[PDB]
Amino acid sequence: MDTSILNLRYESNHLIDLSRYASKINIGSKVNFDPIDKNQIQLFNLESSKIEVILKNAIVYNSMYENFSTSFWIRIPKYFNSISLNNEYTIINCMENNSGWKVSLNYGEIIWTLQDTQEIKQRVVFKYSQMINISDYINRWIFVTITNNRLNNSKIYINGRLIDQKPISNLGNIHASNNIMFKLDGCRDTHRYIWIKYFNLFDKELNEKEIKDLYDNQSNSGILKDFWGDYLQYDKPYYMLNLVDPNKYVDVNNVGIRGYMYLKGPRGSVMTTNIYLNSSLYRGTKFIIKKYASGNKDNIVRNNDRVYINVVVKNKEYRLATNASQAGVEKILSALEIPDVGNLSQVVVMKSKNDQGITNKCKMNLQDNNGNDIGFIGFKQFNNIAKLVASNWYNRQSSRTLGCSWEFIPVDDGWGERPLQ
Ligand SMILES: CC(=O)N[C@H]1[C@H](O[C@@H]2[C@H](O)[C@@H](O)[C@H](O[C@H]3[C@H](O)[C@@H](O)[C@H](O)O[C@@H]3CO)O[C@@H]2CO)O[C@H](CO)[C@H](O)[C@@H]1O[C@@H]1O[C@H](CO)[C@H](O)[C@H](O)[C@H]1O
């Protein structure tokens, strides 16, 4: 039982339809594909930055009663300018002669619109704030699912969860376009772009289980993610965020075995008046993940990869390490001269999943040199200083949010902050 009417995927050297219908795909000259993952497609605010799918005539939506759904991932750069404030722009267009469906965006909004041949319309909308300290949505990959049941509602899901639903049983015949245009249409911000991936159309209303499964399956959950949702990489400098203490950042008081890594504050804020106000993300000692036991030639960090962690202090690389030999649960982490690590413990097991199954935010399980767990890396308040530690206390704990959850943040043009140093 195959409900896919379009499944747009990058294979070999081409974007192609992997559905049974084999619709034709025309790509403009200014479409960018991410080298690390060519399924990630960047569309600028330019006439030539477009992808047009010409649908088989027989699968064009033209009905009073047929249910259908769409799914895709999107990464939306922060809105930077007041010209975006009240400017709805189409991004995925299947409207013709004022009937059909489309996906549009606006300041802090993702919008679905349906319209019948008598111009009766209904919309469902996801809204997100740009005035939030740490956003789950701004410039981070979002999984969108929209379902349409002609007997009752359109529904919009975000990361597998229902956000909005609205009645559409009053709409009559909807006759959509023969082509789907992926293109910024009516956007007045000349600098705007989006990233998109994994666009699908389905000839049914997807149920909650199907949507959750699709989210889980397209998540690439064997691969660790950076803060934006891209693949976490080796050899790439990252700023660290601890989710349980998000107003602080990592620093090293002094390099060497008598120093320690710790959380210090304030992070401070980035703002453009009445457009955004967020915590500064480009703060503290950068981490670089290094290959240790990975067999893959590529630069991708996978679940259970055994690695080293380097830390950058005054533009020079040091090794994250601890002495595991004294009794005591928490092992304070230091930044060591790489040539002088000696018999200190440094091997880290990178985790994208809680157990074989359940996906968690990044964790780093430090090993001793006999291969026993020293514990997940987090932090411990030693009176007035929160020092970074590895601690098996974390390993024994529920599935609540703990101090061992981290995000890895690289500099990205959709965020727009300037690195201070
Ligand atoms: C709440 C707390 O401190 N939890 C610790 C845990 O501490 C245990 C025990 O819970 C605690 O009551 C006791 O604290 C007493 C102290 O030892 C005495 O010297 C003092 O006179 O009075 C204190 C209160 O009676 O200490 C115990 C440990 O010696 O110990 C575990 C390790 O087994 C953890 O350290 C736990 O704190 C967690 O540590 C985590 C990292 O491992 C992480 O940082 C968590 O933030 C933190 O909750």
Residue numbers in the entry: 874 to 1270, 1274 to 1297
Sentences from the paper on this structure:
Botulinum neurotoxins are the causative agents of botulism, a lethal paralytic disease, but are also one of the most commonly used therapeutics for the treatment of numerous neuromuscular conditions. These toxins recognise motor nerve terminals with high specificity and affinity by using a dual binding mechanism involving gangliosides and protein receptors. The ganglioside-binding site is a pocket built around the strictly conserved SxWY motif on the carboxy-terminal end of BoNT/A14. Three HCA mutants, Y1117V, H1253K, and Y1117V/H1253K were characterised using ganglioside-binding assays and X-ray crystallography.
The resulting HCA Y1117V/H1253K showed even further increased binding affinity than each individual single mutant indicating that their contributions are additive. The resulting dual mutant Y1117V/H1253K displayed the highest potency, 5.5-fold higher than BoNT/A wild-type. Using the same assay condition, titration of GD1a showed improved binding affinities of KD = 0.11 mM and 0.22 mM for HCA Y1117V and Y1117V/H1253K, respectively. HCA Y1117V and Y1117V-H1253K presented improved binding (EC50 = 0.19 and 0.14 μM, respectively) to GD1a when compared to wild-type (EC50 = 0.45 μM). The high-resolution crystal structures of the HCA mutants in complex with the polysaccharides of GD1a for Y1117V and Y1117V/H1253K, as well as GM1a for H1253K were determined. The most noticeable differences reside in loop 1225–1233 that is shifted considerably in the Y1117V/H1253K:GD1a structure and disordered in the Y1117V:GD1a complex. Mutation of H1253 to lysine also shifts the interaction of this residue towards the central GalNAc3 moiety rather than Gal4 with which it only makes water-mediated bonds via its main chain. Additionally, in the Y1117V/H1253K mutant, the more distant R1276 (NH1) forms a direct hydrogen bond with Neu5Ac5. In particular, we identified the dual mutation Y1117V/H1253K as a high-affinity binder to GD1a, which translated into a toxin with higher potency in the mouse phrenic nerve model.
